[PDB]
């Protein structure tokens, strides 16, 4: 009597992912009080208006 077995497994995983997130803004003011200019031109990203 004689017996043989062979067993083989191969498994592969590959994963990938990317983000690009660009934000730009350029508020511009002429006239009025310099403090109001600077305070308002400063970009409140939550309220760009």
């Amino acid at each position: 009597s004689s017996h043989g077995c062979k067993e083989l497994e191969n498994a592969l995983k590959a994963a990938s992912g990317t983000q690009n997130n660009v934000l730009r803004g350029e508020p511009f003011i002429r006239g009025g009080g310099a403090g109001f200019i600077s305070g308002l031109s400063y970009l409140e990203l939550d309220n760009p208006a």
Binding site: G17, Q19, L23, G25, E26
Partner: protein, 50 residues
Amino acid sequence: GGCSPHYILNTRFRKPYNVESYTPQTQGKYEFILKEYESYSDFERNVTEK
């Protein structure tokens, strides 16, 4: 001499003789640029012999 009335808001100024103008030409330019980048990559294997 001089002593022409020059005002900014309610404040009145005396201009130097040398100065032609000093005038409140107010302006403001803000500029915001945010760039975020991510990459990930994953690699695995599992391999068996009996």
